[model samples]
Target: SHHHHHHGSIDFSNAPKRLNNKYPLSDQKNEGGWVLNKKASDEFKGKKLNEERWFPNNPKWKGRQPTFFAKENTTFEDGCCVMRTYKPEAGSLPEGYTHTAGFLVSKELFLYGYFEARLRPNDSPWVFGFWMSNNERNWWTLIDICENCPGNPANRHDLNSNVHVFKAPADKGDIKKHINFPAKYYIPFELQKDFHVWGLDWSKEYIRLYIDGVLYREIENKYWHQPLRINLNNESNKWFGALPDDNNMDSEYLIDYVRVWYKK
Candidate 1:
């Protein structure tokens, strides 16, 4: 039932623009019987990216404003995946894009699973994001499993878990209807100072967010069911406020590994 890209007669003038989550956050119970999905996982032990498993840059989007995802900015080193953001030389970038950053998208799309990554965000005003999304024409989706800006003074201690349904089926009416379910949690320590495990346990019923193996937030599965590929990247966003200064222009987001598991 996923093919609803074009509708000739459906008038979508009054579709709802947002949803109010009715579910409350609670501890996520551990589910047993799990098997690793290696194709959707990475260890970063190799000298370079596993080309067969990931694209060094995002295939769908260039990046947010002010920055572009540069394939050269993503590299492997010391058993980790390094996502760098730096100021590019004058006239060395695409028109209007001033900064170069990193983005990597998994080759495989995944459904319900436990997705986790051990990583450290760069110490800059830019954002480090680990999420799952798909670029379906009419039913696009995004699950911000973890979005962090620990380097920014205003959001140094918060972790974000947000989800979006960019477009829905004719049953929901508005082809451009955008629904968001967003949450934030406080962390006791600085995120950029050390590596922490960010985990998302997604099921047909709910999405549980975890940090350092502990549950922090959860949301009911309202409209996120599309199979999505994993994405790890850094970019500039208006919401993050203030751009990086020359002193901090060069920074790195380090990922020890990205792992996935499914029920056996």
Candidate 2:
């Protein structure tokens, strides 16, 4: 079936190894953002996200606004987690926008393992991602599982996977490793139309990425071993496009479930 839900608010923010080639919301302005997630403040790695692992968001970026990440905008529907976005209707809030979006983060951190999710991302002006954050202000460590994705807005049957390492504090450059998984490796029939299990086998030795557990794109280590929090979000920003410049926009990112394994 064709699931047509269309939609960042931004702070701006991809992977793998040895033998491969690759290429990779709405809320309002001036809203409150979560300063930090409620982790133990004394803990890091864990077998699973055993804390209150949902519904928290960072301000995203400075100078720009982020859509509201209210619980009312999220749901556990059809037996899966659905984080959504929509135009808040005219006169619902202040000017310059009329929308609310969703952001979800885990209370746990992970390092070097297998991360997988059975997910389906929607259309443009609002791309969804399965991302990992180092929880650092430098924006130095990010693993882009799927970004600007599902299908290429400009090309059909294309998906994006990448690794991004940047330094925001010392103020310098960064590095990127990318792949248009479907375009360069395999055709994922209809990635946006249904749920596909996306898997990444990441270790010091290699990083293997695949859809439906097929078309594994294996690469050597470009490993950033810092513990990271798993995140799922649907955002809209100038980087992707603004408010869609219209009212006919609605979007969401759905997850049947997300799984992470410790490397053995």
Candidate 3:
């Protein structure tokens, strides 16, 4: 079955067009002008990095490891950005550390637009997703496009999407609400075999999730109001009551370009 539904054609002919500003943080700009965050890259290379740029629930979690850096695998060729994760020389994350890497973009760009990225996860069981944060301090929004637990091998065949909202000042063990979506209801794995677009359209009063241009879910309640950053990450499932085994190092995940469209 087809995963995407074309309600109608999206016309770009008469749409307002503006040149993307060269400045990284210019409000009038529509795209990020700066390259990948160099500070984050340096931190991933074992340099001192600021934690405020990331969203971490555990304060005790050390943020200094190189395993958390999103490696640049392929250049922007063929009209797409390709990022990959391979088997690290260290084998796997140590007992306390999890092999994960994510980047933030609020300092450079933030918008209530349609954001999308094409991706493919390695055959091995691994969890990957697109997430958003309400600044670096309070309130967190998560839209887990896919999460696979070890014990649940069935998860490999079933893709799950979830939405989570965290209360402010997480130090107090804040309250949260979660919503889950099963894969059987949507498209099959054949279409997702290599790379497919997963996206969302967020406005002041609503948020819509999509896969390959098909609308999967839409929420009308607007709880996240502040400016936020986009995050793409891959991590072990220890938090979900599953631990990485011998197959942990063999897995990988690939991401294509992320595009966004907003009202002028």
Candidate 4:
């Protein structure tokens, strides 16, 4: 049971809503057992985004230069939280901002825990990303559970997981302190075709990435112990290749649900 062999059988309809209960993953269970972190989890059953648990837009950052995070773009429909990425009306947006997208950030900060989300990537060059990060102070860290690019031909069906240490203490040195650990796995299914589960298991020791129920990559935890905020966003970044064109306008990043667990 600890091996997490329940592959291709995750049905979110059967997921429990009770707090301090067991989650789907068995291996993540610790000595105190897996207790649901209710404040950081959501089922998206309400008419609007849960304002008590999340922010519809990023507070510290606007977004990737050309892409702006619009609160209106984050909506709930058909039992899912839909984050839309589209070219908004020219005059309606702030000057210099081009396309509009959705960005959701958890109000609470989570330390070492297991965070998982059931989501479907938007079929566009824009990246639909889920991550936990803290960028407020002199020390910053990030853990990207998955950044999917389904519409990019060169990187289709890729599970991109990455970790970053943007700033650190002086003793760690500039070259060694700020670094990135990136991994990519080519899975069998197309990202936009169905909802998939992406998970990050973070402890004092290491960070493990999971796709569905299968473990994909693991990175050593050197300076990522900071309690971070969970973020979900759709962005049109040139790093992923060309920007969204007329054919790729009005794409949606669907999030079925997000669940978090802690051992204590």
Worst lDDT run of 10 residues, candidate 2, spans: 5-14
> Residue by residue across 79-112, what tens digits does model 1's lDDT show?
9999888887888878878888899999898989
Candidate 1 structure lDDT: 0.76
- Whichever of 2 and 3 has more lDDT, that candidate is 2
> What local lDDT score does residue 29 receive in model 2, on the 0 to 100 scale?
23
Please report, in order, the local distance difference test score of every candidate based on alpha carbons.
0.76, 0.51, 0.45, 0.76
lDDT of 4 by residue, 20-138 (tens): 32474424335436778877788888688889899879988888767889898899998799987778777766777788889999999999988988898887778888888997657
Clashes of each: 0, 27, 0, 0
Q: List the residue pairs that clash in candidate 4.
A: none
Looking at model 1, the pairs that clash are none
lDDT (0-100) at residue 57 of candidate 2? Answer: 58
RMSD of 4: 6.1
TM-score of each: 0.85, 0.64, 0.57, 0.86
